[PDB]
């Protein structure tokens, strides 16, 4: 037999490249860097340029730019027009025809930023994997980040792909995201979806866990320092933990009823809650992408229609959604060319 | 030592009980038990409540055609306003139900119960040798609940503006509140959103690093990963400073959002950028703020009844 | 595609993986094949849904 | 705890819970 170990052959260009990439400098480049640093960079650049010079006059009929007189809250990089349904909006594509100015006017900057940002997210996750492999650690941060990347993929690519075009994807801005939120409330009743409920529970529980864990750890510390300040009474090379698990367990078992008794389980729970919540939210938005919304409660609608003297908070929410849709559609969707006369606009006093 | 009062004090303050009671306990336990009993009873079999005071009752009980999502305990009638409305001051029990007294009962008892809960957290921390600053952390949710249930109605002028004790009631409260005050553009709600999202981020990432580090080192081995992943070398090298930061971020965020809600109760507002961009000749160029304003205007027009019979 | 498959199959019957690829992708473990197959069905699921 | 056995079962992995891992096969060139 002719056996073999690991790395018992002649060196190759790949070995030199790998050695250079995985050095120890201020910024760890690694192989994933070749995908992360350029892409992400451009993304940020795009957005900044998008929020500083270009305008959304020809896409949404809006003015969103510092050069046009907008704040940091109102500036945005607006999505392309609904005519460009799902065109990737390459600079060299049939729409822009290679003209950079017309490309910016058509809204291609949004597609540029979105695609480069998606690949930057992929590169960042690969970077986390590479760092963990370099330092021989389990890559749970990779899963914790699998959560937000799933949320981003859903909201920014699957929702517009299931709808009429990129026009209905979120526009990269503060007021733009607020418009997105109110649009979902009006048109999808997103608050009534069980999956946004699960996501809300996950996020709020994550905040609760963070606060409670910090408070408990800082208020069960061991007195290993003469000074009145407890931050200097600790060094990274300690042997024992710096807080009393027994005391915290007893405190939270006598105040609340149940308490943790395992550091690993506690921290894994902290990892688990937000990831699960955001994944549920992502599934819900995937459902919304096909207009499979939780809206009806058919029995309530039937009962409300039968006798006007039956009002629940659900019916009031439905009326508020009707108002939102009717009063927003005129300007939020200019391609529909909607002209609602004041007579037909829903109003409370008409009930 | 053998006096009955001494024995009662020892039992109340004893740390051997399965659930610590304490004096804050002797105050709260009847309060929260009353609140939960009345809440369950009203959520299941309460009759319709005239929230708006225009003889148009709103049904919120399971028996009266509702489910868990759409059920709620309707706030008190707008006719009562801020007036104290116990059972003994209503003309009859039916009128007390009609106007919406159980909401006032539940909210008052619940607020007292949560305050005494914050007190007994400190009390047990003191009886156990722990440091006393978990009540400070708990003061944030307590402050937010106090705002939503007592301070907003105080500023607005009626308990009908408080958050209904329900799910769809909560969503209705949010939608109306956005219509009236434009919460999304207030810096304090922005800080609250930042606090919540950052708390989720930090919980997830702290759990990831600690779980990775814990093998069969807790801060000296994982710090190598985080120092180079997103740079920030020697950002949080202390297991104490890191945990204090965890405790401080969401608590401050929620304090700020509660203060923002209270200020909106006294009604300053969120930001208002309506018609903030105009070209030459004075024409108005729309921004995303204008679309948000259109949505708010629709919400408001639906919220107001005006024509009431 | 059919024809190519056949040809590809023949190649994969008659040519062994390189040692560098054998250790890089951990071809000795049955879990790498699971990961790759999950990715393939994942891709096919998006394609068919679209 | 080391020596996960030829069956891949480790009584207590770094998680502290029992687990099973695949047995990677080592590489050769010709063999007998």
């Amino acid at each position: 037999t002719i056996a073999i170990g690991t790395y018992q052959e002649k060196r190759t260009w790949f070995d030199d490249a790998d050695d250079w990439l995985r050095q120890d400098r201020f910024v760890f480049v690694g192989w994933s860097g070749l995908l992360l640093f350029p892409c992400a960079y451009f993304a940020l650049g795009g957005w900044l340029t998008g929020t500083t010079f270009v305008t959304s006059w020809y896409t949404h009929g809006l003015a969103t730019s510092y050069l046009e007189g907008c704040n940091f809250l109102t500036a945005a990089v607006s999505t392309p027009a609904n005519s460009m349904a799902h065109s990737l909006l390459f600079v060299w594509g049939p729409e822009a025809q290679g003209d950079f100015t017309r490309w910016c006017q058509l809204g291609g900057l949004w597609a540029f930023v979105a695609l480069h940002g998606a690949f930057g997210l992929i590169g960042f996750m690969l970077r986390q994997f590479e760092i963990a492999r370099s330092v021989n650690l389990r890559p749970y941060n990779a899963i914790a980040f699998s959560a937000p990347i799933a949320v981003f993929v859903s909201v920014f690519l699957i929702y517009p792909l299931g709808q009429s075009g990129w026009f209905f994807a979120p526009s990269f801005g503060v007021a733009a995201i607020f418009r997105f939120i109110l649009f979902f409330q009006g048109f999808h009743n997103w608050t009534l979806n069980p999956f946004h409920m699960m996501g809300v529970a996950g996020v709020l529980g994550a905040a609760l866990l963070c606060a409670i864990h910090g408070a408990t750890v800082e208020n069960t510390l061991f007195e290993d320092g003469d000074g009145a300040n407890t931050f200097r009474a600790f060094n990274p090379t300690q042997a024992e933990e710096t807080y009393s698990m027994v005391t915290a367990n007893r405190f939270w078992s006598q105040i609340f009823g149940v308490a943790f008794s395992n550091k690993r389980w506690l921290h894994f729970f902290m990892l688990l809650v937000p990831v699960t919540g955001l994944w549920m939210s992502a599934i819900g938005v995937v459902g919304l992408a096909l207009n499979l919304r939780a809206y009806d409660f058919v029995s309530q609608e039937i009962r409300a229609a039968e006798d006007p003297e039956f009002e629940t908070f659900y019916t009031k929410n439905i009326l508020l959604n009707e108002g939102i849709r009717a009063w927003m559609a005129a300007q939020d969707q200019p391609h529909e060319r909607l002209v609602f006369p004041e007579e037909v606009l829903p109003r409370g006093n008409a009930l | 030592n053998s006096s009955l009062w001494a024995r009662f004090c020892e039992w109340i303050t004893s740390t051997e009980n399965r659930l610590y009671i304490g004096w804050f306990g002797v105050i709260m336990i009847p309060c929260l038990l009353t609140a939960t009993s009345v809440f369950i009873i009203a959520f299941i079999a309460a009759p319709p409540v005239d929230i708006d005071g225009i003889r148009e009752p709103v049904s919120g009980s399971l028996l009266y055609g509702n489910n868990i999502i759409t059920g709620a305990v309707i706030p008190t009638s707008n006719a009562i306003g801020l007036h104290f409305y116990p059972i003994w001051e209503a003309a009859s029990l039916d009128e007390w139900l009609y106007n919406g007294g159980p909401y006032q009962l539940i909210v008052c008892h619940f607020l007292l119960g949560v305050y005494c809960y914050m007190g007994r957290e400190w009390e047990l921390s003191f009886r156990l040798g722990m440091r006393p600053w978990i009540a400070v952390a708990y003061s944030a949710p307590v402050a937010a609940a106090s705002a939503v249930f007592l301070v907003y109605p105080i500023g607005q002028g009626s308990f009908s503006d408080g958050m209904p004790l329900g799910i769809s009631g909560t969503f209705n409260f949010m939608i109306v509140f956005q219509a009236e005050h434009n919460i999304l553009m207030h810096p304090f709600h922005m800080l609250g959103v930042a606090g919540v999202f950052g708390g989720s981020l930090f919980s997830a990432m702290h759990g990831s690093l600690v779980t990775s580090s814990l093998i069969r080192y807790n801060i000296v081995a994982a710090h190598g990963y985080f120092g180079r992943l997103i740079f920030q070398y020697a950002s949080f090298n202390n297991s104490r400073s890191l945990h204090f930061f965890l405790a401080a971020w969401p608590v401050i965020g929620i304090w700020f959002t509660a203060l923002g809600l209270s200020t909106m109760a006294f009604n300053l507002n969120g930001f208002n950028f309506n018609q903030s961009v105009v070209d030459s000749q004075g024409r108005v160029l729309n921004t995303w703020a204008d679309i948000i304003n259109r949505a708010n205007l629709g919400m408001e027009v639906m919220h107001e009844r005006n024509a009431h019979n | 595609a059919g024809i190519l498959g056949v040809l590809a199959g023949l190649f994969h019957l008659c040519v062994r993986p390189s040692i560098r690829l054998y250790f890089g992708l951990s071809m000795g473990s049955i879990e790498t094949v699971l990961s790759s197959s999950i990715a393939a069905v994942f891709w096919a699921a998006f394609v068919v849904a679209g | 705890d080391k020596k996960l056995d030829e069956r891949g079962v480790i009584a207590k992995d770094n998680s502290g819970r029992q687990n099973i891992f695949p047995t990677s096969s080592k590489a050769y060139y010709s063999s007998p």
Binding site: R133, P139, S146, A150, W279 | - | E31, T32, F46 | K2, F21
Partner: peptide, 25 residues
């Protein structure tokens, strides 16, 4: 497809990090 993306991530992580997960050399 989304759930299987998560599954792919998890199983690839448990492949590449086999030694660390098993706590061996």
């Amino acid at each position: 497809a989304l759930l299987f993306f998560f599954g792919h991530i998890w199983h690839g992580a448990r492949t590449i990090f086999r030694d660390v997960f098993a706590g061996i050399d």
